[PDB]
Amino acid sequence: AYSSNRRAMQMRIPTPLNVSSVDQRGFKYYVESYFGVAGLDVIEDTAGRHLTGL
Amino acid sequence: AYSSNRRAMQMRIPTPLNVSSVDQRGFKYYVESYFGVAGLDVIEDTAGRHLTGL
Amino acid sequence: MAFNNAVLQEVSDLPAGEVIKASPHNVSAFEVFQNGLIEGRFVKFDAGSIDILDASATPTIAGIAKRKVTGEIGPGVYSTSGIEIDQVAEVINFGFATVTVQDAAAPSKYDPVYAINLDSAEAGKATENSGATGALAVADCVFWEQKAANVWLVRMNKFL
Amino acid sequence: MAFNNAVLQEVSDLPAGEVIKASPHNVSAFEVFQNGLIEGRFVKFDAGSIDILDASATPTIAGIAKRKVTGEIGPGVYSTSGIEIDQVAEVINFGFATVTVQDAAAPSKYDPVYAINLDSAEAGKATENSGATGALAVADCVFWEQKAANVWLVRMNKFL
Known part of the structure; x- marks a missing residue:
């Protein structure tokens, strides 16, 4: 369960x-592709929690 | 001694x-060149004959 | 390798397993059959399936394995489970049809056909000689005329 | 009974007295017959007339009595002297034809066909059981395939 508020979680x-x-x-043909991406920005550590074993 | 007819053998x-x-x-300039060859497609076996050690 | 027999002396006549449709004729489809059923041979009916002649008590000769013109190129073979899968075994049971003969056999017209009943490559081959090993008297069938090399057009008087 | 089999989960299969024309077939008209000749049944030739099999010893069996598809709605019976009058008893005597099979019979392909040579409604019905009562071998006639309920496609190999 997480929060989708931009002050709490951003992609x-x-x-x-x-x-x-x-x-x-x-x-011989060669193509390359790069994308620069940061992970999920979890701004506040308590904006979600887990249920492990459902 | 062979036959050059298209039905006898082809290249x-x-x-x-x-x-x-x-x-x-x-x-630095660089080029390759390939060709794909099946080679001598002998359509029929008796379309030629050999004489060895002449 | 290359094409076999670049130049043939004579035009080969009817290949084995072929039925002339001018005369009355019947080729009947059997769905279940044996893998590797050689065309142009007599085929028996056993356990509700068309299979190759092999040494048995008194096999039920169901006719001659029809050669498929629009079949797979290769040895005359009925196949299951391949790119060359043959769904049914087309079997000629009435009329004039071409069957391979034993290379030793020298038959003639209105001679009683004998099929070969052995577990070998000669299975289902016709012959005139009744003393040939595994010579089975095919009921009411007679050699008619020599079509090709070791192939004779026989006539099935009644259905097989 | 009123319209037996109201709904069927499959289309009914071929009734008896029906001959497939895809093969060499022959139905030959006999201009005299017996009143009460059941269509889709083995008939016999006796005293210059087609008639239902009875207590006779060695009847000359003509063939399957053909079912006049545009005949009378009702029992598949040939009848003289009525509005339901059939002038000629057309009889299938060559090839693949459907005959009613005895209710207790369990035949299979290439099984020799025995006809019930009895004086009953079970006269002329085909059965594979040689041991059955009042049955004679219809020589040169084999079963081909179960078409309908107690109806089988049999093969008259020669002109029957």
Whole structure:
């Protein structure tokens, strides 16, 4: 059970999925994709709790 | 001594020589070229004959 | 390997397991059958299934395994559970039909057909000679004419 | 009884006296018969007439009495002298034909067909049981497949 209030829990996705342009060397193609993302921002430690074994 | 007729044997070159686009890393240019060959597809066994040690 | 027999001397006649449809004829589908049922051979009916001739007491000859023109390329074989799965065993039981003969056999017209009853590769092959090993008298069937190499068109007078 | 089998969870299967035309078949009309000839039943030829099997010893069995699909609604019976009058007793004598099977009979494919040569309503009914009472072998006739309730497709191999 958690709280969805922005003062209590936020999801941080600074950089979305950024996929590169396909780099070809000879006949071998190679593409790369990076996304920069912070985890879940649990601002206050008591904005949720767990029931372990249901 | 063999037969050159298409129904007797063919040279199967499924992928004729294709040359990759030129890759330029800085001032290093690089190309590959592959061809896919089945080779001599002998359609019929008796379409040729050998004479060894001539 | 390469195509077998680049040039043939003569045009081969009817392959075994073929039925002429000018004459009265019946090929009847059996759904259950034996894997590896050789086409162009006499096939017996046992335990409610069409299977290959093999040494038995008095097998119920159900006819000649019809060769499927639109079947899998390969040995004349009825298959189950493959890319070449054959759903039913098409069996020729009435009319004129082509069956392989034992390479030793030299039959002629209106001769009583004998099937081969052995657990070997010669299973289901026809023959004229009755002293041949495992010669089973097929009921009311006669050799009609030599179609191909070791293949004879026989005539089933009544149904098999 | 009023419209037996109000609802069926499957379409009824082929009734008796019905011959499949996909194969070599023959139904041959006999211009004289006996009143009370049951359609879908083995009939016999005697004294120049088709008639229901009775106490006779060695009847010449013609074949399955064909069911006139556009005949009379009711019992599958040939009848002279009525509004329900059938001029000719068309009789199936070659090929795959449906015959009523004795209520107690449990046949299978390629089983020799015995007909009940009795004086009853059970006359001409097909049975696999040789040991059954008042039954004679219909030579060159085998069972093919259970079509309907106590009805079987049998195969008359030769012109019966």
